[PDB]
Amino acid sequence: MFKDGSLIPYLTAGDPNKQSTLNFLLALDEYAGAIELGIPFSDPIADGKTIQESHYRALKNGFKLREAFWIVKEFRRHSSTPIVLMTYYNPIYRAGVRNFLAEAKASGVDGILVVDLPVFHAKEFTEIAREEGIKTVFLAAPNTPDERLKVIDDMTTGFVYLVSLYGTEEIPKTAYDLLRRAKRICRNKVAVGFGVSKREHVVSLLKEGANGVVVGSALVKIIGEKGREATEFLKKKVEELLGI
């Protein structure tokens, strides 16, 4: 879905507010190869500390499941940059999968990542998304075996998203191991969410096969620091991670 060597900015929808998220996105596009928009949820038991707090914030500031599409609808008015919507199953299962997928397709969403998709509903979900034109994005952690990575790759139409609860300040060997294993198995391109925070992390991961490097934590960190005034600090951090 994105060019090799891509830096993939991740932001939580509505942190601090929807209009502000849109501002940050339009401010990081020039560096992005793709954008990942998260939908805040009550129990983000899969995310790390920093990102869990962005959800806690978004929800505090009054967020609604459909404020995310607005962010995308408006972003499109200026960019074609592929957009992947990140979410927990709950929101989708409540509003209706096909209903949710179709609506995202209308606002401009290209693909979607469901962090905790029940294997019991994975099949139907992938088929529906396909009918609706939404490329799928599946996740894998360091405790994912080669055999599941293969199953994941065969279902994936967008790209495989490798993560690490670990954190860092260096990328843990377990995450590196996961990357190597993924490149050796996945036919789809892969992006890594290993919580980068240093220019040496980006250089190293791209060098090791990561088709794309996601950058969330390091941005959400700043966002939860400067709020609306995060913009400029976001660009300097991105440039740092680029060495520019």
Swiss-Prot record:
PROSITE patterns: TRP_SYNTHASE_ALPHA. The keyword Membrane does not apply. It catalyses: (1S,2R)-1-C-(indol-3-yl)glycerol 3-phosphate + L-serine = D-glyceraldehyde 3-phosphate + L-tryptophan + H2O. PANTHER family: TRYPTOPHAN SYNTHASE ALPHA CHAIN, CHLOROPLASTIC (PTHR43406:SF1), TRYPTOPHAN SYNTHASE, ALPHA CHAIN (PTHR43406). This is Tryptophan synthase alpha chain. It is an enzyme of class 4 (lyase). HAMAP family: Trp_synth_alpha. Keywords: Amino-acid biosynthesis, Aromatic amino acid biosynthesis, Lyase, Tryptophan biosynthesis. It comes from Pyrococcus furiosus (strain ATCC 43587 / DSM 3638 / JCM 8422 / Vc1). The keyword Endoplasmic reticulum does not apply. Pathway: Amino-acid biosynthesis; L-tryptophan biosynthesis; L-tryptophan from chorismate: step 5/5. GO terms for molecular function: tryptophan synthase activity. InterPro entries: Aldolase_TIM, RibuloseP-bd_barrel, Trp_synthase_alpha_AS, Trp_synthase_suA.
